[PDB]
Design an enzyme around this catalytic site. Sequence first.
Site, PDB file in Angstrom:
ATOM      1  N   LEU A  83       0.837  -1.213   0.000  1.00 59.21           N
ATOM      2  CA  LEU A  83       0.000   0.000   0.000  1.00 59.21           C
ATOM      3  C   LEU A  83       0.870   1.260   0.000  1.00 59.21           C
ATOM      4  O   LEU A  83       1.983   1.258   0.546  1.00 59.21           O
ATOM      5  CB  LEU A  83      -0.912  -0.065   1.230  1.00 59.21           C
ATOM      6  N   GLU A  98      -9.287   1.850   9.009  1.00 54.30           N
ATOM      7  CA  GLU A  98      -9.545   1.428   7.595  1.00 54.30           C
ATOM      8  C   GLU A  98      -9.467  -0.097   7.525  1.00 54.30           C
ATOM      9  O   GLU A  98     -10.345  -0.795   6.988  1.00 54.30           O
ATOM     10  CB  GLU A  98      -8.392   2.003   6.780  1.00 54.30           C
TER      11      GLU A  98
END
Length: 186
Positions: free
Chosen positions: A22, A30
């Site tokens: 990521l 999240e």
Amino acid sequence: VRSLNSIVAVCQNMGIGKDGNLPWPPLRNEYKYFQRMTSTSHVEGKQNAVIMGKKTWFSIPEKNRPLKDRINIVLSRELKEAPKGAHYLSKSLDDALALLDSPELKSKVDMVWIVGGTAVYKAAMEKPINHRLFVTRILHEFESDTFFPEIDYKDFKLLTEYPGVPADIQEEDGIQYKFEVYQKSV
Ligand SMILES: NC(=O)c1ccc[n+]([C@@H]2O[C@H](COP(=O)([O-])OP(=O)(O)OC[C@H]3O[C@@H](n4cnc5c(N)ncnc54)[C@H](OP(=O)(O)O)[C@@H]3O)[C@@H](O)[C@H]2O)c1
Ligand SMILES: [Ca+2]
Ligand SMILES: [Hg+2]
């Protein structure tokens, strides 16, 4: 299969990854959201299925595979067998969809979630089937080398509200994001 769900986290340039991972450091909330959304089935004795590409599967820390409480299906045109820890290996989305309809599976599976990458998202978006897309928009720009495919705003209508999805802008580690849900009806 009656309908698909896709879930993704995107930043400002529609980036979803960098160097096999990521683009942002970890966001606790999240993450919990992703887990809760993909794991929660609404039927006793069934489990959700997650479909992902090869690179995505390998992006998960080994000790953390397969995603607990879900049937992990990996897509690859190259592998001969399911990578260690995966439940099933499929050569295309179609194959995966088919498999799911299989008797062995059909009975054991509640929801189908597409968890990326790019090519997987794309394929799923193109099927003329009912589809809900759960997008986390991170309101900042990070360098990315992988992107989310273009969503057809004529097909996918953004819902103004959805059950269990906070509506307001969230904040965590000085970063802001919002959850959005889009819906395609066939
Ligand atoms: N932000 C997010 O929500 C999010 C979600 C997922 C991933 N990510 C990030 O995205 C990156 C991984 O995504 P990616 O797009 O680069 O890779 P990917 O989709 O995970 O992996 C691609 C591979 O998967 C197989 N594949 C993909 N789509 C396929 C299809 N329709 N049929 C058959 N095989 C298919 C192929 O394997 P073969 O080459 O063996 O055929 C292809 O090389 C990492 O940076 C990851 O962290 C972010
Ligand atoms: Ca390849
Ligand atoms: Hg970005």
